[PDB]
Amino acid sequence: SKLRPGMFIQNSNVVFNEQYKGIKILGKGSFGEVILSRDKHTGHEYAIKVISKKHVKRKTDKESLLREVELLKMLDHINIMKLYEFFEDNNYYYLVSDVYTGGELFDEIISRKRFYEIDAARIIKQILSGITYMHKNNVVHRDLKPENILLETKNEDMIIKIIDFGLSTHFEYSKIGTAYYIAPDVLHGTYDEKCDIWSCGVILYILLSGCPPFNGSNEYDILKKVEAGKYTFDLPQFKKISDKAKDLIKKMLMYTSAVRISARDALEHEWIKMMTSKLELSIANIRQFQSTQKLAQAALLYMGSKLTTIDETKELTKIFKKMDKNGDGQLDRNELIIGYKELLKLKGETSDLDNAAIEYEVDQILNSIDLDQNGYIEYSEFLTVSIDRKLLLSTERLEKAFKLFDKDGSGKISANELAQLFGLSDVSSECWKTVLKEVDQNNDGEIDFKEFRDMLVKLCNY
Ligand SMILES: CC(C)(C)n1nc(Cc2cccc(Br)c2)c2c(N)ncnc21
Ligand SMILES: [Mg+2]
Numbered sequence: 001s002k003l004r005p006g007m008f009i010q011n012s013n014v015v016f017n018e019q020y021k022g023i024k025i026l027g028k029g030s031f032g033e034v035i036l037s038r039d040k041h042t043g044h045e046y047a048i049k050v051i052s053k054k055h056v057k058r059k060t061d062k063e064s065l066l067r068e069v070e071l072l073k074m075l076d077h078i079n080i081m082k083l084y085e086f087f088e089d090n091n092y093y094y095l096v097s098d099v100y101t102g103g104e105l106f107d108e109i110i111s112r113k114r115f116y117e118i119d120a121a122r123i124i125k126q127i128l129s130g131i132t133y134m135h136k137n138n139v140v141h142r143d144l145k146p147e148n149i150l151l152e153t154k155n156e157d158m159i160i161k162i163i164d165f166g167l168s169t170h171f172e173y174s175k176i177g178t179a180y181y182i183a184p185d186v187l188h189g190t191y192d193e194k195c196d197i198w199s200c201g202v203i204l205y206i207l208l209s210g211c212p213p214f215n216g217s218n219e220y221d222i223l224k225k226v227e228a229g230k231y232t233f234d235l236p237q238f239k240k241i242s243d244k245a246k247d248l249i250k251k252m253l254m255y256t257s258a259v260r261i262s263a264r265d266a267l268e269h270e271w272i273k274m275m276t277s278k279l280e281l282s283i284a285n286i287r288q289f290q291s292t293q294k295l296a297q298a299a300l301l302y303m304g305s306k307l308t309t310i311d312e313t314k315e316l317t318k319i320f321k322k323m324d325k326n327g328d329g330q331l332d333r334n335e336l337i338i339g340y341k342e343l344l345k346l347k348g349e350t351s352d353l354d355n356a357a358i359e360y361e362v363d364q365i366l367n368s369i370d371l372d373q374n375g376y377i378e379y380s381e382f383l384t385v386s387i388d389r390k391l392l393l394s395t396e397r398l399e400k401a402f403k404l405f406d407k408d409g410s411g412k413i414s415a416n417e418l419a420q421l422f423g424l425s426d427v428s429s430e431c432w433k434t435v436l437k438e439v440d441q442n443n444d445g446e447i448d449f450k451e452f453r454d455m456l457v458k459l460c461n462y
Contacts, residue, residue, distance in 0.1 A: 046099065064170070092351070210237060
């Protein structure tokens with residue numbers, strides 16, 4: 001968790017397979033992190049997903065994965081992520097793909113001023129076209145979420161790009177919005193290509209209403225409704241939505257996979273052929289549903305970072321204690337890096353990419369401190385700044401998620417929305433309510449952002 005999006009590593013000179021030079025971290029996806037990399041010889045830029053062998057187990061043998069890759073390399077579709085190459089070392093699996101500067105689908109949608117029914121039709125059509133092509137070539141996604149649906153460019157020429165296709169069949173860990181889209185076929189272990197239709201049917205339902213078919217402020221609550229398969233159109237949003245659109249959803253959300261509509265039949269459905277041929281939807285509900293998920297995970301990452309950083313601080317202090325032989329408290333720049341590495345060795349786990357992140361971590365803390373030019377640093381001061389910087393980064397991510405959440409709000413969070421946020425964060429109702437008392441002083445039932453953060457801090461303290 002030492003690699004953040006946007007961070008440059010080209011000074012570190014990290015090379016993958018002796019031909020791909022790491023340059024910029026684009027972020028993190030399924031099973032690993034994605035790194036912008038340039039070809040050492042040609043100069044092509046690529047996106048490389050870095051899956052580590054220690055954190056992520058493999059569900060299949062080495063022969064089957066290679067055959068799957070060779071199949072994915074020969075597949076070309078406008079809505080499917082291109083896979084150029086697969087390789088591995090002692091610590092990582094590497095997947096080389098194209099660079100998509102667009103971003104997630106639901107993010108671009110809630111960044112727009114408004115959303116129409118025709119827009120949702122064009123989006124679904126591209127998705128189904130990609131799913132159809134992959135199904136014809138016997139490839140199943142199994143894990144289709146709005147996170148796995150990107151755009152090629154920042155446009156308008158909207159081009160949907162489906163990613164992580166076929167990765168879930170071979171990989172498994174050894175986020176928060178996954179239970180909404182998972183098919184009952186997968187939950188029963190007996191899945192086929194029809195599960196991707198279910199996932200797409202759920203997305204269409206959300207694109208049209210702004211609300212999940214199978215809702216809940218908790219994974220167990222959501223998965224129970226998915227298991228039941230009981231959904232409805234009893235919403236104010238579906239009152240203006242065409243019967244053609246409802247007919248498509250009904251066919252895609254069939255519990256029995258044999259009865260469930262296929263990808264090509266859905267692509268040739270009456271609703272798509274009419275709406276994408278040659279009425280404005282609730283964008284507020286989509287924005288509410290998306291930002292709530294984003295703010296909730298930002299809350300988890302905040303509390304997660306603060307709590308994790310404390311324990312490693314107590315761990316690095318022990319290590320730095322055994323390195324400070326004169327007891328002056330000052331350590332070398334080289335000694336600080338060694339301490340970080342000895343933390344990993346005592347945990348079993350270093351890699352050159354990992355060593356690069358460590359140096360970057362150390363330097364960024366040293367760049368925040370008025371350094372004495374004797375070459376020595378107080379490690380207590382070092383760890384203190386380390387804590388504050390990680391707290392600062394967590395707040396900035398919290399500010400960005402809140403900005404999206406409060407686009408058309410009163411600047412405050414309700415008491416109900418906290419229940420939805422902390423519910424998805426698996427936080428006990430007795431916990432955040434007791435903290436809400438200390439945070440809300442005028443008993444308004446509503447609180448601003450600073451007060452919301454104070455809650456997260458006090459929760460790490462309870
Ligand atoms: C937003 C971010 C998480 C940084 N991401 N994720 C992917 C998807 C992806 C999926 C499988 C293998 C690779 Br390479 C890349 C991806 C991409 N293909 N291009 C640019 N960013 C990407
Ligand atoms: Mg010393």
